[PDB]
């Protein structure tokens, strides 16, 4: 809310979610809208322009206005609405997305050790002089697992971990408050530079995976709590 | 183009691209942009929040918009764009973006035939009387592949297939023209039944990465000849 658009947009968003516009049917008319939301005609268009590149809605010249399945029409870019709408939920998805994370990065980090080896050397070792804070981490692994991703030489995997940044960071600045968070962190950076190093093959999806693991049951116990 | 507002939206993306406005600086008051590209001052804004959420621009209120380094901003919502603005790296663009199709379809059909057998075996069974044509064959290879990732039961693989929809189905509907094309396919949608029945395990791997190889095969020996 705060601003009329983010009032605006928020109100649409959760009457999709709530089905008050279901998914599958007609948005109503702009006019009994804006006078339903309490904003503008011109601050409506845009919101409705916002929530179109979204994938919430289908917006089309001569013709009403859809509420789509955004389930089949969004992308990562919802991640932290999902977040916000279901927090029952919250719990399964950051599991999901760590998941994601670990397995797509077994397939970027292998590809960007033998194809360019020199920049995955470059962002490993920007774990150098880390500042040891939540914040610090959170952001500085964000930056290695996006910067191996476009190590690879496959830009549309840093267009992935882009999409993933919102939420994944969020969860980052959360997780990293735990000292062993970092540490374990720390210790999976130096290992993958070694890796790299070394030219190793099988060593780097099982290190990825356990990685995964190990830093899963960390945020997992600390969920617990929450 | 077209619509005053399509043609504003262009017209800002190519000056993105173009350096007229260089990622990193600040993008022109919206007055003299307005009159620069000729069109209202609320199609403008309407467009600006587009370009917005698109990750081409950052937007404060109280603060100057800056032309964003979209490579660390936009996700696979560009995709389409990218292969509109640079056609010479096209050819490059597509096989990573089939790459990427390859390789994380080898995580979620894994965990799709595992947990949800029920589910990946109901959206391999639609390729059953599919029509001959590329048009129906570019829709169900990307309803196949974005059905497999959901039945995986993490809905974030589905949201990364929803980002690649637009290009990957422009590739399909020229790949699939290819009647080789639509074979093959048919022939792995099939073997991925079996195995899925079977809970064969490394196969499947190993199948979806020849899949990538040789349907990648046949789409580079009909690109070579454009
Ligand atoms: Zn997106």
Redesign the interface.
């Known amino acids: 809310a705060q601003?009329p658009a983010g009032f605006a947009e928020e109100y649409i968003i959760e009457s999709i979610w709530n089905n008050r516009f279901p998914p599958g049917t007609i948005l109503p008319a702009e006019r009994e809208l804006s006078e339903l939301i309490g904003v503008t005609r011109?601050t409506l268009?845009?919101v409705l322009?916002?929530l179109?590149?979204?994938?919430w809605l289908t917006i089309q010249?001569g013709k009403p206005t859809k509420v789509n399945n955004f389930?089949?029409?969004?992308?990562?870019?919802?991640?932290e609405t999902l977040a916000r709408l279901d927090h029952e939920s919250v719990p399964q998805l950051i599991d999901?997305?760590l998941?994601?994370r670990t397995?797509?990065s077994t397939?970027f980090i292998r590809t960007a050790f033998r194809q360019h080896p020199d920049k995955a050397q470059e962002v490993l070792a920007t774990a150098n002089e880390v500042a040891d804070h939540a914040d610090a981490f959170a952001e500085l692994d964000y930056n290695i697992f996006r910067g191996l991703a476009?190590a690879s030489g496959?830009?549309?995997?840093?267009?992935?971990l882009?999409?993933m940044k919102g939420l994944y960071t969020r969860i980052g600045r959360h997780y990293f408050a735990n000292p062993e968070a970092r540490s374990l962190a720390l210790g999976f950076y130096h290992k993958l530079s070694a890796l790299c190093s070394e030219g190793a093959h099988d060593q780097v999806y099982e290190t990825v995976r356990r990685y995964g693991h190990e830093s899963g049951e960390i945020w997992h116990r600390m969920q617990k709590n929450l």
Chains 1, 2 share one sequence.
């Open positions: 601003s011109t268009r845009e322009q916002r179109a590149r979204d994938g010249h389930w089949e029409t969004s992308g990562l870019n919802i991640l999901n997305l998941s994601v397995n797509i397939i476009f496959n830009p549309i995997y840093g267009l992935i882009n999409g």
